[PDB]
Amino acid sequence: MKISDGNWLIQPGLNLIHPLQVFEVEQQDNEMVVYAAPRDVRERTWQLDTPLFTLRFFSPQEGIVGVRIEHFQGALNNGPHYPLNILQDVKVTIENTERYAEFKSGNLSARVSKGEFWSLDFLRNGERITGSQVKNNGYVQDTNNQRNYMFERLDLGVGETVYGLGERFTALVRNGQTVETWNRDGGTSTEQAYKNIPFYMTNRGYGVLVNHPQCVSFEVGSEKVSKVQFSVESEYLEYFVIDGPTPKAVLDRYTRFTGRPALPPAWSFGLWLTTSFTTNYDEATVNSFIDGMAERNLPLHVFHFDCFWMKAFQWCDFEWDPLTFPDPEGMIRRLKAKGLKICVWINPYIGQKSPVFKELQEKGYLLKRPDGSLWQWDKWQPGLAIYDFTNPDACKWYADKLKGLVAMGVDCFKTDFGERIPTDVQWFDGSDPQKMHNHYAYIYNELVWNVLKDTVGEEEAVLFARSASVGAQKFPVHWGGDCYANYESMAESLRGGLSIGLSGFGFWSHDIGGFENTAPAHVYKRWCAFGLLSSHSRLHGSKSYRVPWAYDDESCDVVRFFTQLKCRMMPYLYREAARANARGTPMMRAMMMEFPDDPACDYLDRQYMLGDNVMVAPVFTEAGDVQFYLPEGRWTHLWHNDELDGSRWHKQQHGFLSLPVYVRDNTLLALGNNDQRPDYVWHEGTAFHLFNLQDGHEAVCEVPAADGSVIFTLKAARTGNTITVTGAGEAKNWTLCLRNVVKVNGLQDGSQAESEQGLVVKPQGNALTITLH
Amino acid sequence: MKISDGNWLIQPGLNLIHPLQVFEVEQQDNEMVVYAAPRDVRERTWQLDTPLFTLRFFSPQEGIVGVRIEHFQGALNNGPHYPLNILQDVKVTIENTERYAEFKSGNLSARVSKGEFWSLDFLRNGERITGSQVKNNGYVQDTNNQRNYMFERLDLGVGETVYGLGERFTALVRNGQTVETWNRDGGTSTEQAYKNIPFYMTNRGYGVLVNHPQCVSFEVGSEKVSKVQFSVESEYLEYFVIDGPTPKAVLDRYTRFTGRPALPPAWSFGLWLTTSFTTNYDEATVNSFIDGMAERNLPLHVFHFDCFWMKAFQWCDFEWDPLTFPDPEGMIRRLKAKGLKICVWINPYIGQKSPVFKELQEKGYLLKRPDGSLWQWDKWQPGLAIYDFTNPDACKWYADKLKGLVAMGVDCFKTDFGERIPTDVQWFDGSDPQKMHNHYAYIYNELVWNVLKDTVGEEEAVLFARSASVGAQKFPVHWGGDCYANYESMAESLRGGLSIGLSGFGFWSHDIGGFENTAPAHVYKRWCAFGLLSSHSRLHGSKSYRVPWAYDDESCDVVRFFTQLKCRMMPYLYREAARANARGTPMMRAMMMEFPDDPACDYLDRQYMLGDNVMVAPVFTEAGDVQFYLPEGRWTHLWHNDELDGSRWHKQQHGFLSLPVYVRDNTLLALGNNDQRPDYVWHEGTAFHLFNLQDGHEAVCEVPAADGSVIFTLKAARTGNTITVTGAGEAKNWTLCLRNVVKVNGLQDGSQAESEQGLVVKPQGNALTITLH
Amino acid sequence: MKISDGNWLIQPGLNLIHPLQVFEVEQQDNEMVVYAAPRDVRERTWQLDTPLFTLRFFSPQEGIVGVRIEHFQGALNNGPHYPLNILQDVKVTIENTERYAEFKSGNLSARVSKGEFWSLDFLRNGERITGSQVKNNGYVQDTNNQRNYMFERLDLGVGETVYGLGERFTALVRNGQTVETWNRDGGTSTEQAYKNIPFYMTNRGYGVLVNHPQCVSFEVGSEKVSKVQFSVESEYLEYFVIDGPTPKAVLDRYTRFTGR
């Protein structure tokens, strides 16, 4: 939102006031309050006929400093509020001197300067990381529209770059962009987002959450080029500065504060196939697809029924279409015998045609206008109404329908929609409609998640969710929505993927082959490789099917190859998943996140790290040309075994069975012995692979159990030309490949054999030692 | 401007129509006209009650394709128009087949698809470089404000980045930003710009000029993330796709098309000092600065008198203040004996207080409101009026005043302001005020330039101009305006400098030490090194002086060292300057422009190429730490002589007499024998420096005469361990340094002496051969 | 109320949608429900992001067919209602074929045509007495006043004349006249009436009661010269076609229905 008109002017009709001078500082228990005047009030003659700002500094968690800046306290201020974990006795330091008032939590402090030169500074052990210069926060009285706003502008240093703000599909680095945090259904092709989060982070190792569920308007270097401005229609502005000092540590604090990604069941990590959207489907079509996958030796783990499992125009009423699915329990029973998991489409809206609509209206379960009539429009469904999830009775009715589907054998739910929530309404609980617009996504998904938790168990709960708001990362599996079948959209989808993990979400999928339009085979092929090298992998389309044989026969080989690889990669991947749940470190990582000190990584958006150790770079061309950057070290292709030196860019050409997938040096990586399913006994039959262990380094590998805890730890320490290998825990029948090592000088405690990938050492105990040539 | 409301919807109150089907194609001489309906009109029943788009394709210059899309032709459409060089006889090809209508100029064609699948593609020898997909152009009937617009969205490929759009201070790469081409006085710290140009170019080697002097609203990957959208309030949209296939080749075409930067006289390349803005100043003050510079052995070449050479509130009446400057012609005559060139501040406004105002009002020389009264406001000067430069008599009056200052010994003018031109007015010539807002900067600067041309001569003409519009690069020296004295603003000014060169402008200055506020000594020192390594170097401040002794002792050594260096680099710099005049390649070049195929260079904005051969990376910290990227090759520090290998980033720490200044391999560079002035006989006493001549390569150095032409060419060709040095033309008493080569085996036809930087050879004639040890 | 602007155009700022294609037919005991889309919804790709009309046919008395055409059902809809004598067990026939959905009470049926050529016809012993041609009913979103209307136009054949609509002092035959059913004290010398009734009958031996006590705006051969248009500010329109086949027989059914 534009406040200034260039450097010298203010937008017409705006009147501004700013905290310009400390008047008084008070400590109230573990919080610091600062009263600041918008003009010089040292003389009693000026200590009247003036506004006064009240600034409160507090800490909800170690290393997070809260800043509340307020004008009038008498405003209404109804919920909902973000589901923040606020601790009550965080240890803090408050120093009030002649020069400064300073509030400190962990290594992070907020310091305000007293006297004639106002400053608000955020320090990390006395070093300035950002802050607000005088006249860069305060109150906007907009006389054009009679609305009042609070705002702040936080400095960006030379070369400081901004990330996050939700799943967005614009350029990855936010500098230069205006961003409104307001859920919409705009597809993946525009400035709009289905999933908005008013949190950003920088390459200087801090983050900021602006604590307002309504629309927050960020001008990220787009109004004042060297500041992040944010404003909100409110009598107060409250935000949290979150210390790092690395992007991963910021996200650790952030997810602790707003919610940890749950750990999805291992099965969800396999291949998902759908019916597609407006295509035809019935039992025969579905069986056709499952069978065709089987006959082509293509592993398939989850099948999803899209919207037309219900009758047209009655969507979300939970009634199977009797002419298309005359035996729903029997069908799902048949499909389950194979070992398939089943998903079905739901949403939080209801079309007027449904016999159930009348029941909901009589019962008062639907979103009403202030006059008591139903809110309705004709987008998505005719005479569409919205389930009011602030009504406990409506929540129960909707939960019950879902339990009914679970009792028939559905394992999970695609929680679609939830974005276009109107504000000209009155919620059952009298919530603020401006805050409910975004927070509805959370309430909706939380409701669904809780149904699964109560029926299949927490360990088995998973969603495929389109919309989100602060906290919703606790309810995993988010997918990038309605992309298009071309390279540009595949690339914009990845930007959204990176962005969502930079916003606290650990798991992310996208429609392989693209949702809208039919891809040429080459595009679908390139996208298969990307999709199976994402945390979650789904084949879904709008008007055409996504089975590989709708494209060409080489496509079946592509799906087969990469599905096998993902299943063999599950021991590494699922440990990486437990890391999202424990530390909020997403599986798909921006390069800047894994290598924060490397200036070459600042703008990388065509490649990513999949967990700690593997760099993936999807190929965005038919001919297979691809350019990617490698950070310092010696990297090894995961299956080609070729080696590349880092700190530079590389250019390659790959066939449809290939893409750059490079393993970090000093790495010990577990691959499993099952390429047919993701959920298996990973610690039995394990093939450990050691990559470029340098002298003086130790590479560690933790093999997880089904619950994500560590069940076996293998470590390899290089001391001179000796490598000592120690195991600890539980593993059977494992193996250790010395990557690009053809010959060895010595070996206590085990036997050797040659492989194409290098020497394979089979242990006798868990106490072997190798001596190199 | 927002047109879509996400992928699926349109902004409320907008009605769109688009060219969706070719109805008829016709060749009109060397132009191709496509009539395109907004619906299916194959049957006669639909060939009525419909709008129709008329698309005209034409070529004003080889490798430029103009596209004009019109709705109504009956609109007024008055001037002014851009000063484009439009040729009538460009050789073109037009092919009308059953599939396509294609128009080709040079290697570049526009191709429209007939039949059901409309497409408009721009092809480089049959390869699609960009294009407009169906429904991504056409007409907007805005029923909210009753205005109509035309728009286009040109595709961006994966990894395609956008540059230019004028001197802008936001992030260098435009993806993600909204840009309005509307001149404003916004300082350097916002989204606003003094110098707007509706031309952009990309890393895919094409450019586009949108041919509308009124406000053009660009959404660069900020409405549709994979497109550049531009719209304009008009019944037609006309734009030009400009072929490369290289950024330099794009600028070569663009500047032949809209205007070549003039070659500034060599003296303007020295050090400029000013009185500063609102400081005190009179003849004694000025003498004290000039003698002050001399006593410290700090070369100074140009002195500038800012606004208070005239009486306060009378600004731009051209009358010396007789209490501050009682003898102007004597003073300047005295100042000139000391060799100095003289600049004075002018602008195109006049305050009411001036006795000349009444004269101008009675003569009708000032801009009027439609009722015949004067347009006035109180910003800048009280009762400020604007000189109406569409009035031929007003132009003459203003030019004669300027001729008066020239006859007094003024050498050049600072053409300040020209941006805040109101639209609620009636121009003497009846021009469209929406078009006059930007074009006024052209007409103003053109007028001042022609005064110089007619008095001192074309080769002696130079300005220091704040605003600009298409074609104004012809009137060089532009400076980046009112920046602030800190690192963030030094950095934002560099983004502006890079961007203006990416928009057609050859020469660019910035206020050394920052304009607003007083820099700490360290910042002034860092900025001095950046300023003296920019095409044009000026010391200028707002409320404080910019003589180095106002900061500290070391600042005088800093100014001295880099002034001496610049004067010595002149043989190389002036040659690079002649390049801006010939090919429109600016002196300060974004890394992407010099290394278009290096993916590491797309986003670099804190370093630049100064000419073909020299990379500079200003230092933006007190302690002197700096990170920079080096393209492939082996680079040598210009004076420290250390070597670094390319294709990677580097980190260094530099003292105040230093920064990264690296010379690429296979370079023969000329330094001169005068460190006291920029204008001297470069081809006598020349010291040539050979850097890392690889086997098989040849290095070429062209020493310029005072008019830019090549007066002497030196070539060094490596065959094996033999390098052949041949000169041609006129040079005297030159030497050749073999950088980092201590000893040689053979030397046929020269002498040799060691130096700290390598063997110095002195030739016997135009032909030496050297045999490496 | 003016909806069309001539044969070819629509009044500025009015947006119209019309029931154009049978999507689904359902019998609900003695009532017939027709779902009708305002566009071609044969393909699933078009079975979303569209309005949908819900038409219900029912009979409150022998020889009277009730037609209720509705857009949104969530509107307030408060009383009072007309004091209608509504029977629950009138004998009716419902036929749902590939070509037609037909609702019949006594000798009077309403028949909607399925497929590409929507038609709403009122039949007496299988002969068309009047009807609604495609695009002559639907919903009006008036963007000028932010009000929404439902409307219908019933055909008039050659020489078919219109009578009634209450105690009115203009020419007895209504063809050519706009009439608003809104009680007023205007004397006897104007277009205004103290006694308004939204019932007309014709010399072809049927009548129609528009079932809305609020202002009903009739254009009787005055906007479309061969139709009686009626429109009401509402999310649904409900009217009754009352068979005769004689004027006295119409009035016999009419007064049995509304009061003797």
CSV table of N, CA and C in Angstrom, one decimal, chain B residues 647-691:
chain,number,residue,atom,x,y,z
B,647,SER,N,34.9,-17.9,-13.4
B,647,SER,CA,33.8,-18.8,-13.3
B,647,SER,C,33.5,-19.1,-11.8
B,648,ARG,N,33.8,-18.1,-10.9
B,648,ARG,CA,33.5,-18.3,-9.5
B,648,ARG,C,33.5,-17.0,-8.8
B,649,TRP,N,32.9,-17.0,-7.6
B,649,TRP,CA,33.0,-15.8,-6.7
B,649,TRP,C,34.3,-15.8,-5.9
B,650,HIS,N,34.6,-14.5,-5.4
B,650,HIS,CA,35.8,-14.3,-4.6
B,650,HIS,C,35.4,-13.3,-3.5
B,651,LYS,N,36.1,-13.4,-2.3
B,651,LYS,CA,36.0,-12.5,-1.2
B,651,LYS,C,37.3,-11.9,-0.9
B,652,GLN,N,37.4,-10.6,-0.7
B,652,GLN,CA,38.7,-9.9,-0.4
B,652,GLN,C,38.4,-8.8,0.6
B,653,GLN,N,39.4,-8.2,1.2
B,653,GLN,CA,39.3,-7.0,2.1
B,653,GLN,C,40.3,-6.0,1.5
B,654,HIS,N,39.8,-4.8,1.3
B,654,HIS,CA,40.5,-3.7,0.7
B,654,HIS,C,40.6,-2.4,1.6
B,655,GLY,N,41.7,-1.7,1.5
B,655,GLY,CA,41.9,-0.5,2.2
B,655,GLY,C,41.3,0.6,1.4
B,656,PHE,N,41.4,1.9,1.8
B,656,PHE,CA,40.7,2.9,1.1
B,656,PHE,C,41.3,3.3,-0.3
B,657,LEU,N,42.5,2.8,-0.5
B,657,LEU,CA,43.2,3.2,-1.8
B,657,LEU,C,42.9,2.1,-2.8
B,658,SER,N,42.0,1.2,-2.5
B,658,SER,CA,41.8,0.0,-3.3
B,658,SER,C,40.4,-0.5,-3.4
B,659,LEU,N,40.1,-1.3,-4.4
B,659,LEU,CA,38.9,-2.1,-4.6
B,659,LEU,C,39.2,-3.1,-5.7
B,660,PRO,N,38.4,-4.1,-5.8
B,660,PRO,CA,38.6,-5.0,-7.0
B,660,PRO,C,38.4,-4.3,-8.3
B,661,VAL,N,39.5,-4.2,-9.1
B,661,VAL,CA,39.5,-3.7,-10.5
B,661,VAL,C,40.3,-4.7,-11.3
B,662,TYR,N,39.6,-5.6,-12.0
B,662,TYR,CA,40.3,-6.8,-12.6
B,662,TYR,C,40.2,-6.7,-14.1
B,663,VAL,N,41.3,-7.1,-14.8
B,663,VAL,CA,41.4,-7.0,-16.2
B,663,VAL,C,41.4,-8.4,-16.8
B,664,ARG,N,40.5,-8.6,-17.7
B,664,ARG,CA,40.4,-9.9,-18.3
B,664,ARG,C,41.6,-10.4,-19.1
B,665,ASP,N,41.7,-11.7,-19.3
B,665,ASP,CA,42.8,-12.2,-20.1
B,665,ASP,C,42.7,-11.8,-21.6
B,666,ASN,N,43.8,-12.1,-22.3
B,666,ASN,CA,43.8,-11.7,-23.7
B,666,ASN,C,43.5,-10.2,-24.0
B,667,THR,N,44.1,-9.4,-23.1
B,667,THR,CA,43.8,-7.9,-23.2
B,667,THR,C,45.1,-7.2,-23.4
B,668,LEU,N,45.1,-6.3,-24.3
B,668,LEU,CA,46.1,-5.3,-24.5
B,668,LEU,C,45.4,-3.9,-24.2
B,669,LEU,N,45.9,-3.3,-23.2
B,669,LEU,CA,45.3,-2.1,-22.6
B,669,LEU,C,46.3,-0.9,-22.6
B,670,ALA,N,45.8,0.3,-22.9
B,670,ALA,CA,46.6,1.5,-23.0
B,670,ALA,C,46.4,2.4,-21.7
B,671,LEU,N,47.5,2.6,-21.0
B,671,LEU,CA,47.5,3.7,-20.0
B,671,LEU,C,48.4,4.8,-20.6
B,672,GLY,N,48.0,6.1,-20.2
B,672,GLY,CA,48.7,7.3,-20.7
B,672,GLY,C,49.7,7.8,-19.7
B,673,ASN,N,50.4,8.9,-20.1
B,673,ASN,CA,51.5,9.3,-19.3
B,673,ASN,C,51.3,10.6,-18.5
B,674,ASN,N,50.0,11.0,-18.4
B,674,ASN,CA,49.6,12.2,-17.7
B,674,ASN,C,48.5,11.8,-16.6
B,675,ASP,N,48.9,12.0,-15.3
B,675,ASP,CA,47.9,11.8,-14.2
B,675,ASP,C,47.3,13.1,-13.7
B,676,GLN,N,47.3,14.1,-14.5
B,676,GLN,CA,46.9,15.4,-14.0
B,676,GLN,C,45.7,16.0,-14.7
B,677,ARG,N,45.4,15.4,-15.9
B,677,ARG,CA,44.3,15.9,-16.7
B,677,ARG,C,43.8,14.7,-17.5
B,678,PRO,N,42.5,14.7,-17.9
B,678,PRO,CA,42.0,13.6,-18.8
B,678,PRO,C,42.3,13.9,-20.3
B,679,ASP,N,42.5,15.2,-20.7
B,679,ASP,CA,42.6,15.5,-22.1
B,679,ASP,C,44.1,15.9,-22.4
B,680,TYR,N,44.7,14.9,-23.1
B,680,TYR,CA,46.1,15.1,-23.5
B,680,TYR,C,46.4,14.2,-24.7
B,681,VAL,N,47.6,14.1,-25.1
B,681,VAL,CA,48.0,13.4,-26.3
B,681,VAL,C,48.2,12.0,-25.9
B,682,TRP,N,47.2,11.2,-26.0
B,682,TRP,CA,47.1,9.8,-25.5
B,682,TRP,C,48.1,8.9,-26.2
B,683,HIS,N,48.3,9.2,-27.5
B,683,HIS,CA,49.2,8.3,-28.3
B,683,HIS,C,50.7,8.7,-28.3
B,684,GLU,N,51.1,9.6,-27.4
B,684,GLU,CA,52.5,9.8,-27.1
B,684,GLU,C,52.8,9.5,-25.7
B,685,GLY,N,53.8,8.6,-25.5
B,685,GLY,CA,54.3,8.2,-24.2
B,685,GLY,C,53.4,7.1,-23.6
B,686,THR,N,52.6,6.5,-24.5
B,686,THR,CA,51.6,5.5,-24.2
B,686,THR,C,52.2,4.2,-23.5
B,687,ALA,N,51.7,3.8,-22.4
B,687,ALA,CA,52.2,2.5,-21.8
B,687,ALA,C,51.2,1.4,-22.0
B,688,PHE,N,51.5,0.4,-22.8
B,688,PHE,CA,50.6,-0.7,-23.1
B,688,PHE,C,50.8,-1.8,-22.1
B,689,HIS,N,49.7,-2.5,-21.8
B,689,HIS,CA,49.9,-3.6,-20.9
B,689,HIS,C,49.2,-4.9,-21.4
B,690,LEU,N,50.0,-6.0,-21.6
B,690,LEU,CA,49.5,-7.2,-22.1
B,690,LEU,C,49.2,-8.1,-20.9
B,691,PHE,N,47.9,-8.7,-20.8
B,691,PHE,CA,47.5,-9.5,-19.8
B,691,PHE,C,47.2,-10.9,-20.3
